[PDB]
């Protein structure tokens, strides 16, 4: 899911793939660039990518429309204590499904036991797992001198 700022007129910037096919984009209505707490504003944006391209295909094959909006929290979702309210609730993407603000989650949500107990998942569209990201080691000799 690539998020990019909308143009001045409010439309989606038109960019073409290398092969010449056009990039499909949808208008997101996520929060500001930094956070919506102090700058309480949800600027519209342009969204495109693998999940959105898959979402557009789902709509055509199931005959429905959509309103894509980013996550207010910016987090995928976990169960949290939060002693201030003394209640277990989900935060973010997982918390927007159950609260009714979202009918669907078209995003990289992994299928968890904790998540699958409350919400249901489709069959995976991307089989994956957990790895490590480390910096490439640029070769460079430690030979100080010929001696």
């Amino acid at each position: 899911v690539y998020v990019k700022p909308t143009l001045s007129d409010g439309t989606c910037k038109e960019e073409f793939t290398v092969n010449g096919d056009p990039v499909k984009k949808v208008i997101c209505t996520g929060p500001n660039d930094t956070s919506p707490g102090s700058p309480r504003h949800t600027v519209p944006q342009c969204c495109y990518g693998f999940c959105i391209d898959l979402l557009i295909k789902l709509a055509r094959t199931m005959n429905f429309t959509y309103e894509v909006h980013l996550v207010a929290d910016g987090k995928f979702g976990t169960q949290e204590r939060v002693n201030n309210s003394n209640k277990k609730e989900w935060n973010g993407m997982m918390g927007e499904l159950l609260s009714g603000q979202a009918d669907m989650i078209v995003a990289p949500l992994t299928i968890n036991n904790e998540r699958a107990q409350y919400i249901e998942f489709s069959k995976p569209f991307k089989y994956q797992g957990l790895t490590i990201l480390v910096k490439k080691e640029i070769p460079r000799s430690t030979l100080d001198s010929f001696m």
């Binding site: 299928i111 968890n112 036991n113 904790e114 699958a116 107990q117 069959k123 995976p124 089989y127 010929f146």
Partner: protein, 280 residues
């Protein structure tokens, strides 16, 4: 042979020849007594011979300060060659290997008739792989009928005999066979290129209340890592963990022969060019 000694080193040493030779010829030899004329060309042929494993006939200087400069250079030529073979030895010790085939996207699977000698490949029928091939590539499906096998074991050996060079089946089974193959010969293509990616699963009766509990029970094993040990115990491999000494052939050493061939061209060019000089 071009791998050690980044080109900044080689180019810089050439500069050192011309600085050293010009100083030896025009400063250390003219000013010194005892000075069989030692020219700039005779100096370049001498320093160059020293760097490249001193073997050519050379004409040494006569002054004591030109010999010291030359003997200083000979020390540089010793280190230069020493650190060339030493770094060349490191490259040959740390080397890898590459593959040949690309994958299922190649036209060999799609078009086996109007192409190279017939690539023979096939799959065990009455399964899910046959359905995907039948529905997606009808042309490939008919061509695969003659090569259909009766089991995994039959098809695995036919690759070793040269009967087949491509077998199409499940990834979780095929990659397990190549993981336990004796001798480490059957190697997949793409290092795990999987097409029409799907999964396994317990087929439960439709509209059963056990599916919800079975699904979470499966995801329990993922959560607490029971599937990591089950994969390690049951799906382990011998050659899934992983340098060899290969001779140098013309293919590996054609680079050095191209340079010798180009030197023949450069010498011939200067032959006609120097002819044009004196002729004019």
């Amino acid at each position: 042979f071009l791998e050690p000694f980044s080109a900044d080193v080689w180019v810089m040493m050439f500069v050192m020849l011309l600085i050293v030779s010009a100083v030896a010829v025009f400063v250390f030899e003219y000013f010194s007594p005892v000075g069989p004329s030692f020219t700039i060309g005779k100096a370049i042929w001498l320093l160059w011979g020293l760097v490249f494993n001193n073997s050519v006939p050379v004409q040494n200087p006569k002054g004591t300060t030109s010999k010291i400069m030359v003997s200083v250079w000979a020390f540089f030529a010793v280190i230069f060659l020493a650190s060339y073979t030493a770094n060349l030895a490191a490259f040959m010790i740390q080397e890898e290997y590459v593959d040949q085939v690309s994958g299922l996207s190649d036209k060999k699977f799609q078009r086996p008739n109007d192409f190279s000698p017939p690539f023979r490949f096939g799959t065990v029928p009455n399964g899910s792989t046959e359905r995907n091939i039948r529905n997606n590539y009808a042309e490939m499906h008919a061509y695969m009928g003659k090569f259909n096998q009766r089991g995994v074991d039959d098809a695995l050996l036919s690759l070793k005999t040269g009967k087949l060079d491509a077998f199409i089946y499940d990834a979780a089974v095929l990659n397990y066979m190549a993981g336990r193959d004796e001798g480490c010969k059957l190697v997949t293509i793409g290092s795990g290129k999987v097409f029409a990616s799907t999964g396994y699963g317990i087929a439960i009766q439709k509209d059963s209340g056990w599916k919800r509990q079975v699904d979470l029970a499966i995801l329990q094993l993922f959560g607490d890592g029971e599937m990591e040990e089950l994969e390690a115990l049951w799906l382990t491999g011998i050659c899934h963990n992983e340098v060899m000494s290969s001779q140098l052939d013309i293919d590996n050493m054609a680079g050095v022969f191209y340079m010798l061939g180009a030197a023949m061209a450069l010498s011939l060019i200067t032959f006609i060019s120097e002819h044009l000089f004196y002729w004019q």
